[PDB]
Amino acid sequence: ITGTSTVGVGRGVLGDQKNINTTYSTYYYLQDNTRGDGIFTYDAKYRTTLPGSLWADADNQFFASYDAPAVDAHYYAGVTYDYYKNVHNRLSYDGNNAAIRSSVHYSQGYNNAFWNGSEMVYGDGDGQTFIPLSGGIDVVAHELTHAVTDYTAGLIYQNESGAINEAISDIFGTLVEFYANKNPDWEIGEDVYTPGISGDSLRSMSDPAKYGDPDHYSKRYTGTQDNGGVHINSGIINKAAYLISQGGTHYGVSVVGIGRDKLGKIFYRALTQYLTPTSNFSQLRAAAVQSATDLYGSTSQEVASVKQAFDAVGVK
Amino acid sequence: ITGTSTVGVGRGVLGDQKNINTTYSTYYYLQDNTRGDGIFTYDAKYRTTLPGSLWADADNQFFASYDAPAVDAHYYAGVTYDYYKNVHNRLSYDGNNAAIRSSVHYSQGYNNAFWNGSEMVYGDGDGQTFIPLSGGIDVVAHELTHAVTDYTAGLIYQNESGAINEAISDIFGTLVEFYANKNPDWEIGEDVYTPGISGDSLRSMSDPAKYGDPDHYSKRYTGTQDNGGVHINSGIINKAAYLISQGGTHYGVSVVGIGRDKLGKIFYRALTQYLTPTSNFSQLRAAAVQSATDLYGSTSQEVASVKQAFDAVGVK
Ligand SMILES: [Ca+2]
Ligand SMILES: [Ca+2]
Ligand SMILES: [Ca+2]
Ligand SMILES: [Ca+2]
Ligand SMILES: [Ca+2]
Ligand SMILES: [Ca+2]
Ligand SMILES: [Ca+2]
Ligand SMILES: [Ca+2]
Ligand SMILES: [Zn+2]
Ligand SMILES: [Zn+2]
């Protein structure tokens, strides 16, 4: 819409109050003109037709419980845009400020959220397994990171390249959650998963095996479900990335941590420069070693920790 | 694009030659202005970013092997539009001539095709399990029928309503395949599935059990895979629809067939008037009985055959 840029206020899924960028033109719309070509949030009104209607509001105050998922989708797409711009100097997901669009209230009781190739889509959850999925900054950033991967490496969504795809999304979802310093941790989806149970999450990067995902290449899943285990085998890479950052000893192999910032620089370089659509885990290791080499030198501690972490999870 | 409407020629996935509606403006584009707000076919160029580029061609002749999937996507979206308009007096999937967009060459070796909420997407197959999926008119019509269902009943994509969703797509995909009289049959996906094996298909409506799908409500799948069995439990409804059309005796229950045309009128009425997002099999039976009643009278043979078919597959 063409209108005047303004600032409205509302409450997110978890009850927290936040200011959001809106546009006025008769109604106030969830349209943020301050970032790139804009961030636009739509109401899918419980249907599966997309994108639905651009979210319009009569008074620029978004405190209704139906508003909550929209506030957070719109706000956390902004934080994710800011992370990539400020940290990695990337303008939006295509590198050229493409507009970011998200639809909330997709379908009824839908327990998922996803990047569909053109925009973000968020279900409201059934209220038992999940609450509206846009309330999780690591979910939002995880899904927006699929758009980055689609425009750069192009990792196909199956077997080892799909598992890399998924792990890259977990890593950057987690780095965005630390960037916003939103009670940060190495788990995925803990703010919106099972409102009735405290302490659990969807996946764990620090200990993937807590939920039954593999933490070593010898335990990888080799069947056909989940497109060859893309959500299951991503645990092997997530555990490597946690070790590079935080350090630790894993199946007897010791890794000195180099921290989150360098972890993000190494993987972002590897994703945008060396990975290709059919990369598998062994070429991810070569790509990460080459990236750390480019950045810190072949005799650095950063290269040595990248090699130790992949050796610890059995990836040669 | 703005240009002049013209007619080009090409070859589809199966090697057959066909005329397709195109638009000229410097290049010839796959843009058909003769139907509704237009039918537009895009090249996703082996990436997952959508929709990709509107298909452009220098000489309006589409005989290259890369062109094949595009020719058939564009041509079979036209035939499906024509079926719904001519038979059911419905203008496009929203009933108001919405433009139909399709992208082909999606990803690499992708064994699937789908309606994503906004457009059609077709993989090229891996060449062993499938060949480019737009070469199957029943696949194209199956997926375009999800768009119709999304705008009308809105059946959610899980457990019994998702299985109805899937069966409705198989039924109308099959009726479009008979409408175009393209070697018609009651199987799904036989033209593009396993190029190396003759005689098989993806599903069967006349005998779902041939591939292991249930053909009676007592054999339904009750777990969690496939969103609660939406592709598996659709066999119960597909077998009912085959019996209403063709007749037969199934688990001892005899059904007089009333033919394909009335089958399509009863289900289209039931879909656009009585089904809702959470309809389950028992309410599909009530909706089909009410539709046949509206159209043919409560003491007709058409009502009696609808009841016998659902009684034959155990749906009360
Ligand atoms: Ca308001
Ligand atoms: Ca957290
Ligand atoms: Ca987290
Ligand atoms: Ca929980
Ligand atoms: Ca040509
Ligand atoms: Ca056939
Ligand atoms: Ca068929
Ligand atoms: Ca075959
Ligand atoms: Zn993902
Ligand atoms: Zn389907």
Q: What is the 3-state secondary structure (H, E, C) of chain A?
A: CCCEEEEEEEECCCCCEEEEEEEEECEEECEECCCCCCEEEEECCCCCCCCCEECEECCCEECCCCCHHHHHHHHHHHHHHHHHHHHHCCCCCCCCCCCEEEEECCCCCCCCEEECCCCEEECCCCCCCECCHHHCHHHHHHHHHHHHHHHCCCCCCCHHHHHHHHHHHHHHHHHHHHHCCCCCCCEECCCCECCCCCCCCCEECCCHHHHCCCCCHHHCCCCCHHHHHCCCCHHHHHHHHHHHHHCEEECCEEECCCCHHHHHHHHHHHHHHHCCCCCCHHHHHHHHHHHHHHHHCCCCHHHHHHHHHHHHCCCC
Catalytic residue status for A74: no
Q: Round to whole Å and give the CA distance between A161 and A227.
A: 11
Q: In chain A, which residue's Cα lies nearest the Cα of B278?
A: A108
Residue of chain A whose Cα is closest to the Cα of B148: A49
Backbone torsions φ then ψ of A103, nearest 5 degrees: -120, 140
Residues A286 and A273: their CA atoms lie apart, in Å, by: 12
Asked if B157's CB is within 8 angstroms of A48's CB, the reply is: yes
- Please say whether the beta carbons of B185 and B88 come within 8 A: no
d(CA A209, CA A207): 5
Distance B18 CA to ligand 5 centre (A): 14
d(CA B168, CA B181): 19
Residue B69, preceding peptide bond in cis (omega within 30° of 0): no
What's the CATH number of domain B155-315, 3.30.465.10, 1.10.390.10, 1.10.10.10, 3.30.470.30? Answer: 1.10.390.10
Which residues of chain A are within 8 Å of residue B277 when distances are taken between CB atoms? Answer: 46, 108
Contact call for B110 and A277, based on CB within 8 A = no
Distance spanning both ends of chain B, measured CA to CA: 52
β-bridge partners, A39: A32, A100
**Topology of the domain covering A6-154:** Elastase; domain 1 (3.10.170)
The answer to whether the annotation marks A177 as part of a ligand binding site is yes
- Tell me how far apart the alpha carbons of residues A295 and A50 are, in angstroms, rounded to a whole number: 42
Cross-chain residue pair A108–B151, CB shorter than 8 Å: no
Active site residue A302: no
In the set A74, A105, A143, A160, the catalytic residue is A143
Which amino acid type is present at position A177? E
Domain edges within chain A:
6-154, 155-315
Q: Which of A283, A165, A159, A277 is nearest to A229 (CA)?
A: A159
Backbone angles phi, psi at A299, to 5 degrees: -110, 20
Resolution expressed in Å: 2.0
Cα A39 from Cα A32, distance rounded (Å): 5
Contact call for residues A76 and A141 (beta carbons, < 8 A): yes
Q: Do domains B6-154 and B155-315 have the same CATH topology?
A: no
Q: Which residue has the tokens 């070469």?
A: B135
Q: Indicate which residue of B74, B105, B143, B160 is catalytic.
A: B143
**Which residues of chain A have a CB within 8 Å of the CB of B51?**
118
Q: Give me the sign of the Cα torsion angle B87, B88, B92, B93.
A: negative
Q: A100-104 and A120-122: which strand pairing?
A: parallel
